[PDB]
Paper text:
Recently, a newly identified type I-F variant, known as the Cas8-HNH system, was discovered to lack the Cas3 helicase-nuclease gene in its CRISPR loci. Instead, an HNH nuclease domain is naturally fused with one of the Cascade backbone components, Cas8, generating double-strand breaks in target DNA molecules. The RNP complex displays an overall G-shaped architecture, comprising single copies of Cas5, Cas6, and Cas8-HNH subunits, six copies of Cas7 molecules, and a crRNA molecule. To elucidate the molecular mechanisms of target DNA cleavage by the type I-F Cas8-HNH system, we reconstituted the Cascade complex and obtained multiple cryo-EM structures representing the target-free, partial R-loop, full R-loop and ssDNA-bound states.
To further reveal the DNA recognition and cleavage mechanisms by type I-F Cas8-HNH system, we reconstructed the Cascade-crRNA-target DNA complex with a 56-base-pair (bp) dsDNA target containing a GCG PAM and determined two cryo-EM structures representing the full R-loop state and the partial R-loop state at resolutions of 2.51 and 2.57 Å, respectively. In the full R-loop state, the whole 32-nt protospacer sequence on the target strand (TS) was observed to pass through a positively charged channel of the interlocked Cas7 subunits. In the protospacer sequence, every five consecutive nucleotides hybridize with the crRNA, followed by a single nucleotide kinked by a β-hairpin protruding from the Cas7 subunits, forming a periodic “5 + 1” pattern. Five periodic “5 + 1” segments are followed by another separate 2-nt sequence base-paired to the crRNA. In the target-bound state (full R-loop state, unless indicated otherwise), a 5-bp PAM-containing duplex (PAM duplex) was unambiguously traced based on the high-quality EM density. Compared to the target-free state, a hook region on the NTD of Cas8-HNH protein rotates inward to stabilize the PAM duplex in the dsDNA-bound state. An Asn-wedge helix (residues 193-198) protrudes into the target DNA and unwinds the double strands after the PAM site. Specifically, in the full R-loop state, Cas7.2 rotates outward around the axis at the Cas7.1-2 interface. In the partial R-loop state, the HNH nuclease domain undergoes mostly minor movements compared to that in the target-free state, whereas the HNH nuclease moves away from the Cas6 subunit by approximately 11 Å in the full R-loop and ssDNA-bound states, thereby disrupting the HNH-Cas6 interaction interface.
Author numbering:
A (entry chain E): 0 to 254
B (entry chain A): 11 to 335
C (entry chain B): 11 to 233, 236 to 333
D (entry chain F): 1 to 10, 15 to 242, 244 to 337
Write the structure that this text describes.
Amino acid sequence: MMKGYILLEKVNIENANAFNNIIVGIPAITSFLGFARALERKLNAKEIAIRINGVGLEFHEYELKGYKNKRGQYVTSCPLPGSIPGQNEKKLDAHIMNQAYIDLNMSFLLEVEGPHVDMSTCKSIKSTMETLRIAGGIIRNYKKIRLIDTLADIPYGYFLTLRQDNLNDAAGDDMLDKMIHALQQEDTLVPIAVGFKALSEVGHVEGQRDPEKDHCFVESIFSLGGFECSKILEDINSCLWRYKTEEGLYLCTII
Amino acid sequence: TLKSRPENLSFARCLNTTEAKFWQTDFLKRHTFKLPLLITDKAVLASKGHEMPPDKLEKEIMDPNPQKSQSCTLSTECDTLRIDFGIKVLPVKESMYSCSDYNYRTAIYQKIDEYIAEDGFLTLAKRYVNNIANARFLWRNRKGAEIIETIVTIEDKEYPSFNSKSFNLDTFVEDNATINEIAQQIADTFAGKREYLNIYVTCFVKIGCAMEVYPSQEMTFDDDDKGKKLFKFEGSAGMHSQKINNALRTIDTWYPDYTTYEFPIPVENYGAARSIGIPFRPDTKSFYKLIDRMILKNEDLPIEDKHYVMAILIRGGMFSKKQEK
Amino acid sequence: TLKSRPENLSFARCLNTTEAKFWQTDFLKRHTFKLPLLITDKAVLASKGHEMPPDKLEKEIMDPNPQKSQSCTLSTECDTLRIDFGIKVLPVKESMYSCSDYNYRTAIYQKIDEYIAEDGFLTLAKRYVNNIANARFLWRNRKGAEIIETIVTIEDKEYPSFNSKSFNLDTFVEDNATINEIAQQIADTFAGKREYLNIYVTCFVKIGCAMEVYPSQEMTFDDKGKKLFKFEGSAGMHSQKINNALRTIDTWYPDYTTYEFPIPVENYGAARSIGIPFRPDTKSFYKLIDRMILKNEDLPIEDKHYVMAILIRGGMFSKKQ
Amino acid sequence: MLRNKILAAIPEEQKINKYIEGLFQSIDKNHLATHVAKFTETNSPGNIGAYDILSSDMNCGYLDTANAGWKEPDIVTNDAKYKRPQGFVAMEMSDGRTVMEHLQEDSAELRHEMEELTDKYDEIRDGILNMPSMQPYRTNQFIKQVFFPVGGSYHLLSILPSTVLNYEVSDRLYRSKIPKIRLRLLSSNAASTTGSRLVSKNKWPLVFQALPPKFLEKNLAKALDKEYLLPDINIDELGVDNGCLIDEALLPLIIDEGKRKGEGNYRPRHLRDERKEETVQAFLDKYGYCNIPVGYEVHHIVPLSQGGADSIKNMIMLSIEHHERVTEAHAS
DNA sequence: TGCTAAGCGCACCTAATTTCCTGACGGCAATCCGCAC
DNA sequence: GTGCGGA
């Protein structure tokens, strides 16, 4: 019954997950969209009807936990492991698996659709964001939660957008060769993770987190992305990530 | 009747801490002035003084040993160190992110409500505020200091300060008004009567003019370089959040043999402190056996074991049944 | 009841020394006037005078050799070098960073308490103040000096000065009142009767006008030239070089009556100067600490002096199994 | 040869019996896989994984395990004890070929060499040529489980990592110039615990680097621009009556403090703290007046334009005639 | 409290050659493995 | 409470 835009401005996230089996860097888009969905689910239990249908991701600064060597390469750092459940839980030294962590400052543009979208909604989002996480990281501080109307009320930064056309129109003989060639031609693009693909059928197995839902075994899928500034942008709708679900595919796309 | 712990149970931290950033100051101008502190590169020439087999000792006793390192020191015009971090407190019953069985959820919620009824999270909160009052988050930066001063701010109210050299690291005080007033609010946040609490902690340590500050050291695995690497947070020196939290959880004085060893240990699932290589709670007073005696075979425990179980649930972790294939 | 050393044993320093900063003054106006000293960039042309194989020597004997370097000298109007550093003294029973067995901790604490019961850390502390009094931390800046004066300040009391060209470098004085007065406070800090002590040291070296000053050089690891140490923009010295010059207090090695000189305190007694290891099998630290704690034997007092000197120096002393 | 080899890998005859006897008791415990579970946490009970042999698309917009060109499958067990087959099918023979390629064609080159060293090459070859596939049958606490919204409700998804894709990113990035990162966290013993051939061969993989552009990286310069200075004088006991500077000689003190602090720190507008009216409200409270005593103006002793905090401390109320003095001196 | 409005700021040509750029010794010890018997 | 098994 009404539609608007809410901006979450300059949020500090400390120690967010940065490993997706072929990528070390920016976290996957599904974590940010799940943060938006978790905020939606927590606002609807306080009897405040709202629906978040699109999120835009803006970047201001980053820091990867580690250091840069003299040759210009990164060496990651991980915390010291503690007690882990299993057969060797009573030991003093535990195992070291594969992990990576990142630090971010970002801003979020949320498209909300509900019966009322005033500043009391902004106060409720301010009261409901001090009990949530982004990726697996904690929120130290935010600056201000406010409503926006046009492109000129947005702070300066660089947004992330999908560039699937630059991947389907390149090289050949397999998709990974297209990925490597497209990354060698234009140097301002990054590989990102954009959702999941099925590896089995839907059913019920033993050992689930919730034993009353449907279950599928999945694999992560990867695509290409790029950065555009906030003063060279056309429309709000061309930087908003949304959910899309086919049969066997769970994705995140910019229509 | 319930027979085993559920197949998926998980908890989250209720005391979340942020990273610390270091500064240099002067003590008589410590409320107006601050300078950045940076890490430098140091390379040394040494001698081989490790224990070697007698064959290698005859060949390598007099050989040079260059190594690489890093260091952090104050300037020649500043004499104090300033440490600033922050803590977020969240409720206990809203920190269960997974529970497969519904009856175990009901039973554990009833047990936490009965713990709110008798000693509503006040003793544990008093111990956590004490471990902010004696400044145990200074690990090697507490040795050799003339004045240690700690200030705690909640919301927009600055509380009166602490002299952190007047508290002993082995006794817990329960008669200070400021500690009691912070502990009541942390108890109310733990008990559900509030929903979030934000604490800001600032510490001033006077060590001397050009003295050595000891930052946190990183665990990195590279083959070309093998040297000491220290933490750099936004260009300056700092300490990890995990270090400050271990210091805060050193509140356990209820292990089975405390009359022989009379120091408090950190709260862990088997009493495994990294200082002593023998676990302190290995079979009968462990977390799994006490929570299987509290919930699954309904029985009243002594209050110290309840204190330990609730402190483990504030710490967090993956607490589930042995996974079968 | 104790077999073996614990799997994680380490100690921490009880004499923490700061880095040194260098200044230039005049001797008659040294209490009211100090100027900064800086490092300059030099480049020199040379001749090929290194030893070469006979074939290459016939082709590369009259060839020029450009090289890069660095240097530090005083000005034309200044004649005195001023070096400033500081020392922090910490107790010895509270310098134990890691021990994985409680019984070994109790045994070590009992032997240190027996040491404080016989000699209250006084001989070693007198040797440490003696190495401040003769200015052994001036390594190559001590050759060719007219007057050397060293002042020691603790708190807000400036102790009377020292003439560092009247102390021999091979003998230790035990009759000087100022040395005894500082050494008693250092001994009380080592014992545990006080929690810390901060000592600041200032030294004046008259060497003349426009003469050379020798700072510390930085270590290079790959494939290099001469780089000198800079501390806050000025020249200076490493803390390790000063601390090595304050630990040359060992005169208890087995073959001291032949070579009558003090050596620095290490685990196997290795002298880099004179190329002989002096404590290689039976009087090393490992055998003595395994014959003191693990078999309860009363050693002579000189071996106890060596063991407590190593435990004031610090290190990693861990056994595998 | 496959001779000396089967000995290096430990009389000299009971030996060759031990290897081949130990081999046949384990060729029914090795399965084939493209996705394995203990590559995330090696404490996952069982042999849970998958074999995805499906069809490519080549123009879909996304990379997967079926759109890339994986060339070699993977062989996986549950316990390291049982891992001889993966070594056995890895020993290179005389022609620089792998037991694998010879067992698919049966060139007698092997036919001959095995039959002198064993009596059961027939049974072994059938158990390396028809191998069972890995099946996903259950889940545990060590496999990552997440929720995903599907049409008014949710689906629970368990993510399994890809072993064949990790091996082919690392080979195709060792000969390339795009940014990459090497992870050196897995040891040799823990790699064997995973049970896969491709992880015990590549235990320190090479992966993609995906970072924001390099003008947006934190440093000390972009951290001293979010802090603000405060003065070194407390007016409350300092020549001043109720906030107003009575002594004309104390003006130079304000000029020298403003000259000292915030001298060479110019900050553009975007980098300046706002000027909220509450602080000049809060300053007056301490001294009353309910109103600015006209003929006086609030001056931040440290310009909020050369770096200064918008705080009660960083202001002092001075006369307009005095104010014309200070705003010109600090401008100059 | 006010301190100007307009226009414009060259065309040419070039920027050296030789010889060489060190010899030594060395670059840590500890720990980070599930599983079937 | 042991010892296996690879790269």
